Structures are given as C-alpha cells and as structure tokens.
Design a protein around this ligand. Structure first.
Ligand code: O31
Ligand code: ZN
Length: 159
C-alpha cells in the first residue's frame, strides 16, 4: 500500500522506488522527490520515520511528488538550455537523447523497450549534470524505443 526506497543510482543519486508489483525511479528536485503516477499512484512513501503523504499529485501529467526523504539530496535544474541530454536508467545506463521539443527527445540509436522498462521517474541530464526533465513514456515501434517523452524540469516546482 506504500512506496519503498529499495536502492539508488549514483550519478547526485536517483532513487529506486518499488511497490508490491512495480519498480521505477524517483528524482529529487527543489526539495521534492518526483516520480510517475502510473508507478506510485497516490501512495505514500514509507520508511523508518513513518509514511509520508504525497504533496503533489497530477494524474493528467502522470506526475507525483513527496517531500524529499531525509538524506535525499535534490539535483540541480538545468538552466543552460541544452538539447543534448542523457537518460539515466535504473541499471545506471546513460542513454544520449536529442531534445526535439518541450517534452520529447529522440534517441541517437534505438534501444529495446526492455532496457528502458522500469526507469520512469529517472532524470534526463544535460552535459553539466543538471536535470532537464523526468522520464515518463517512450515512443515505441516494433518493440524498439526510438524517442522518449518526459516532464520538463520547469514543471517540477514547489507550487
Ligand atoms: C508503449 C509504452 C512504452 C508502454 C508507453 N508509451 C506511450 O504511451 O507513448 C505515448 C506516445 C509518446 C508519449 C505517450 O503518450 C501517452 C502518455 C502516457 C503517459 F506516460 F503519460 C501515462 N500517463 C498516466 C497517467 C495516469 C495513469 C497511468 C498513466 N500511464 C501512462 O503511460 C503508460 C506508462 C508509460 C511507461 O511505461 N513509461 C516508462 C516506464 O519505464 N514505466 S515503468 O517504470 O516500467 C512502470 C510501468 C512501473 C511503472 C518510461 C517507459 C519505458 F518503458 F520506456 N507508458 C504507458 C509508455 O511509455
Ligand atoms: Zn544544463
């Protein structure tokens, strides 16, 4: 009934989040751990200090957020306007992406969908290591990922 922190990806650190049936990622920005609604639902984030309710919940945008747990450092938002980005997966893979719009990025080389599965909520990073977006969905054809869809970092604000 809650989301648990089961691991992390060391870049800053991306959180590996899991429910009873699904595992995905969480990215802390502006004091908030952001993730995807299709993974966490409206569930709380659990831990030794007790469950903590989501402070942001947007079903339409597939975006949820909790107050950053103690110790979860926030990543710096990208302000350099880069279009050459890097998707960080739950396996610590860093996949180059060319931004082609406000929420879309093309992959330089198609990757099987199985290799991106479970990395929703992970960050897209600019060449400076700053978070430009948050992995939400993949453009899939013949089971091969050719592009990604992400929540822009600008939408990851407190209010
Ligand atoms: C074909 C496909 C790849 C399955 C699918 N593509 C797709 O739909 O592309 C279209 C065209 C371009 C953008 C997108 O427009 C529709 C928007 C979908 C959405 F994302 F906004 C979304 N909003 C929701 C809001 C509320 C409740 C449920 C929602 N469900 C959604 O979408 C669903 C979920 C999302 C997903 O699987 N994301 C990833 C992932 O890893 N998840 S996960 O960790 O393993 C896991 C399931 C444990 C949590 C990162 C991609 C990985 F697999 F590469 N989906 C389906 C897809 O990506
Ligand atoms: Zn940047």
């Amino acid at each position: 009934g809650s989301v648990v922190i089961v691991g992390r990806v060391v870049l800053g650190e991306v959180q590996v989040l899991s429910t009873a049936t699904q595992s995905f990622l969480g990215t802390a920005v502006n004091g908030v751990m952001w993730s995807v609604y299709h993974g966490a639902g409206g569930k709380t984030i659990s831990g030794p200090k007790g469950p903590v309710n989501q402070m942001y919940t947007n079903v339409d945008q597939d975006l949820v957020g909790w107050p950053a747990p103690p110790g979860v450092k926030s990543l710096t938002p990208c302000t350099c306007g880069a279009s050459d980005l890097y998707l960080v997966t739950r396996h610590a893979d860093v996949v180059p992406v060319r931004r082609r719009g406000d929420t879309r990025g093309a992959l330089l080389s198609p990757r099987p969908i199985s290799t991106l599965k479970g990395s929703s909520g992970g960050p897209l990073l600019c060449p400076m290591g700053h978070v430009a977006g948050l992995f939400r969905a993949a453009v899939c054809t013949r089971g091969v990922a050719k592009a990604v869809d992400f929540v822009p970092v600008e939408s990851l604000e407190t209010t």
